[PDB]
Amino acid sequence: ERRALKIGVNGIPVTLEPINAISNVGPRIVNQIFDTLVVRDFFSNGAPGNGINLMPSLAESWERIDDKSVRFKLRQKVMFHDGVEMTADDVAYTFSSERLWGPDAIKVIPLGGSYALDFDEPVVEDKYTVVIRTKTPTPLTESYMASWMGRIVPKAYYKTLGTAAFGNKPVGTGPYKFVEFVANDRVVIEANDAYWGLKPTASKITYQLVAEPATRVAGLISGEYDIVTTLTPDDMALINSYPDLETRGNIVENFHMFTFNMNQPVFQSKPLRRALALAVNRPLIVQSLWMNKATIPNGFNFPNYGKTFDPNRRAMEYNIEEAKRLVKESGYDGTPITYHTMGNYYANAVPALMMMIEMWKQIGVTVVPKVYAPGGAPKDQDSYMRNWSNGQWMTDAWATMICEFGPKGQVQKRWGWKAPAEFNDLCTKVSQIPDSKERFDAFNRLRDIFEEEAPAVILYQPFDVYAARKDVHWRPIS
Numbered sequence: 255e256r257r258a259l260k261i262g263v264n265g266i267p268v269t270l271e272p273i274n275a276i277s278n279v280g281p282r283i284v285n286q287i288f289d290t291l292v293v294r295d296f297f298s299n300g301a302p303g304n305g306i307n308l309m310p311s312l313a314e315s316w317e318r319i320d321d322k323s324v325r326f327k328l329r330q331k332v333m334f335h336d337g338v339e340m341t342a343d344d345v346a347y348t349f350s351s352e353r354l355w356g357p358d359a360i361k362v363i364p365l366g367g368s369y370a371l372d373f374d375e376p377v378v379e380d381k382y383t384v385v386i387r388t389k390t391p392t393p394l395t396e397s398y399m400a401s402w403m404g405r406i407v408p409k410a411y412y413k414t415l416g417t418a419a420f421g422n423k424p425v426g427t428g429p430y431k432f433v434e435f436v437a438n439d440r441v442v443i444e445a446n447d448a449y450w451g452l453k454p455t456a457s458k459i460t461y462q463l464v465a466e467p468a469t470r471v472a473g474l475i476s477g478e479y480d481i482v483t484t485l486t487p488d489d490m491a492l493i494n495s496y497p498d499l500e501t502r503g504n505i506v507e508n509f510h511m512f513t514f515n516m517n518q519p520v521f522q523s524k525p526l527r528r529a530l531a532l533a534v535n536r537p538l539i540v541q542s543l544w545m546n547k548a549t550i551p552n553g554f555n556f557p558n559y560g561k562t563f564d565p566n567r568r569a570m571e572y573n574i575e576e577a578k579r580l581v582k583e584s585g586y587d588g589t590p591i592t593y594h595t596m597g598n599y600y601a602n603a604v605p606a607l608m609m610m611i612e613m614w615k616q617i618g619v620t621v622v623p624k625v626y627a628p629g630g631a632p633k634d635q636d637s638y639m640r641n642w643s644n645g646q647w648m649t650d651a652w653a654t655m656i657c658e659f660g661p662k663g664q665v666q667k668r669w670g671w672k673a674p675a676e677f678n679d680l681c682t683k684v685s686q687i688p689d690s691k692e693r694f695d696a697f698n699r700l701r702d703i704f705e706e707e708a709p710a711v712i713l714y715q716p717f718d719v720y721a722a723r724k725d726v727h728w729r730p731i732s
């Protein structure tokens with residue numbers, strides 16, 4: 255009654271440490287190894303899978319005490335995979351200055367600080383009670399605990415190994431336990447029948463990298479894989495013609511983009527970045543490669559932001575006249591610019607790049623594709639243009655404009671974006687004020703600066719498609 259599942263995936267994460275595994279490919283694995291304190295109810299308030307009401311998980315209950323503090327009462331007798339009982343000490347360590355948000359924690363969780371709330375040190379009240387605290391007020395704590403930043407780690411084991419080594423031999427509380435990790439190849443996990451929640455329904459899960467999507471489709475058809483990920487609308491007709499198979503597709507709260515290494519002289523200033531942005535004909539790409547199923551957002555602005563979503567914001571601009579003028583102004587040499595892509599790790603990455611290369615040729619810029627294999631990513635000094643994505647992981651516009659593009663983020667710190675001082679001051683501002691017209695307007699000003707500066711260029715939200723045998727009723731791919 256419990257099958258061993260074989261899952262053909264687009265990629266494999268670089269680690270299984272849950273924060274450092276945040277990517278398009280990590281969470282589907284780490285969400286089976288680890289649990290959170292609370293979980294989102296994806297079908298609350300009539301939502302078709304993107305609901306936000308919070309429900310108990312490792313925490314049986316919780317109470318917001320004040321604008322800075324939330325007490326969690328933990329489930330008792332929850333076992334980590336190595337037999338150690340989870341306690342409030344583990345939860346406190348998970349959100350500690352040492353592990354997550356303090357100064358030295360950046361050396362090993364590079365993005366921990368940028369993706370953290372303004373935490374203060376947790377307080378352990380007793381074995382099963384912990385208080386999560388923030389130095390300044392925020393309403394986001396509880397929902398943050400249901401996010402991909404909330405996965406609970408075992409303090410003693412993790413601290414002994416350290417972040418990096420723990421990521422190669424992870425121990426969690428989740429329904430599946432670690433068996434093996436081969437970089438750029440596979441992860442195997444097995445049923446944890448000591449799980450505190452519903453008994454696992456699969457005996458084992460193997461996530462196998464299959465880089466080419468047509469090979470993933472063919473492996474589903476042959477029975478080599480039970481489930482495959484990261485397909486496109488074009489694959490659906492063929493798969494659905496097999497009575498034993500099916501596809502599922504939906505718009506995801508994630509956007510595809512391209513971005514720049516702004517430490518490189520050719521992109522240190524906005525003119526050539528903005529020229530490349532203004533020449534992207536998004537409706538043509540969507541009609542050609544996505545069967546008109548991918549969604550083009552009106553800026554860095556998504557409905558899940560709730561009170562900081564602007565439903566009346568203007569479209570992102572397409573203006574080849576202005577693009578040509580900026581190519582001339584920038585002083586651009588005609589020298590080819592590389593665009594690195596890890597094959598089709600992002601669905602339609604290579605065919606979308608080929609369409610954009612032609613769009614860029616029409617404005618006088620020569621862009622060359624550099625298609626590489628997993629593990630073959632270039633050193634930052636050899637990177638110029640590259641593709642990326644951002645998952646919109648909070649019900650607030652703080653993520654990902656501030657997380658990724660704010661003064662504490664990687665776009666400014668690692669990739670060298672010298673953002674206007676006004677942008678960094680508005681990032682600081684929205685983070686210290688509550689939902690209101692000043693906050694809503696500040697996000698619209700950040701969005702405008704983002705478009706004028708072009709540190710990245712938003713393409714669209716992909717229509718994500720997965721496929722599986724109909725007789726495989728549980729699919730651990732999100």
Ligand SMILES: O=P(O)(O)O[C@@H]1[C@@H](O)[C@H](O)[C@@H](CO)O[C@@H]1O
Pocket residue numbers: 276277278279642643644645646654658
């Ligand atoms: O495109 P990727 O697979 O690398 O994954 C990105 C992360 O890098 C990013 O940290 C996060 C939040 O913005 O969204 C995605 O998961």
